[PDB]
Amino acid sequence: SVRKFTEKHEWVTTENGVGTVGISNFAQEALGDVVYCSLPEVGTKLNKQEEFGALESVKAASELYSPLSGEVTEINKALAENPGLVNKSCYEDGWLIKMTFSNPSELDELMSEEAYEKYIKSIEE
């Protein structure tokens, strides 16, 4: 019952068969100020690894890939008017989507926060 990460610098938290997905601090730094969030429709089916949207900044687009197989249940409506929540609160108020997840074994494939710490330390050295 802890946050896990992807090698593309996304995160997911889980409770009750529902995952909440966002981007890590490393990811939001790499983008700079987010100007637009392209998010999926509620009810969209996703496979793990499937594209679900994109973030835009002056610097780049960043394509979003699902960390889990399942079905979108919520998108963060605050990001239409306040996309910069992704930078100011990437783990909390700047969450992107929530989804039910159909294959719990998939979490075992993701990175623990300890592994993600080691990952970004090695990248940044």
Author numbering: 1 to 125
Sentences from the paper on this structure:
The bovine H-protein is a monomeric protein of molecular weight ∼14 kDa that plays a central role in the glycine cleavage system. The lipoic acid prosthetic group, covalently bound to Lys59 of the H-protein, interacts with specific sites on the P-, T- and L-proteins. The gene for bovine H-protein was isolated from a bovine liver cDNA library, and the purified recombinant apo H-protein can be lipoylated and activated in vitro by lipoyltransferase, using lipoyl-AMP as the lipoyl donor.
In this study, we applied the high-pressure cryocooling method to crystals of bovine H-protein, and determined the X-ray crystal structure at 0.86 Å resolution. The high-pressure cryocooled crystal of bovine H-protein belonged to space group C2 with unit-cell dimensions of a = 84.73, b = 41.40, c = 43.28 Å, β = 91.57°. The differences in unit-cell dimensions were less than 0.5%, even though the crystals of bovine H-protein had a high solvent content of ∼55%. The interactions and the positions of water molecules for crystal packing were perfectly conserved between high- and ambient-pressure crystals. The final model consists of 1172 protein atoms, 300 water molecules and two glycerol molecules. Hydrogen atoms were observed as peaks in a hydrogen-omit electron density map calculated at 0.86 Å resolution, and 48.9% of the hydrogen atoms could be visualized. Multiple conformations were observed for 31 residues, and 23 residues shared multiple conformations with the ambient-pressure structure. The r.m.s. deviation for Cα atoms is 0.12 Å, and the r.m.s. deviation for all atoms was 0.61 Å. In the high-pressure cryocooling structure, 196 of 300 water molecules were in common with water molecules in the ambient-pressure structure, and the r.m.s. deviation was 0.48 Å. We observed no significant differences in structural comparisons at ultra-high resolution, and there seemed to be no artificial structural variation resulting from the high-pressure cryocooling.
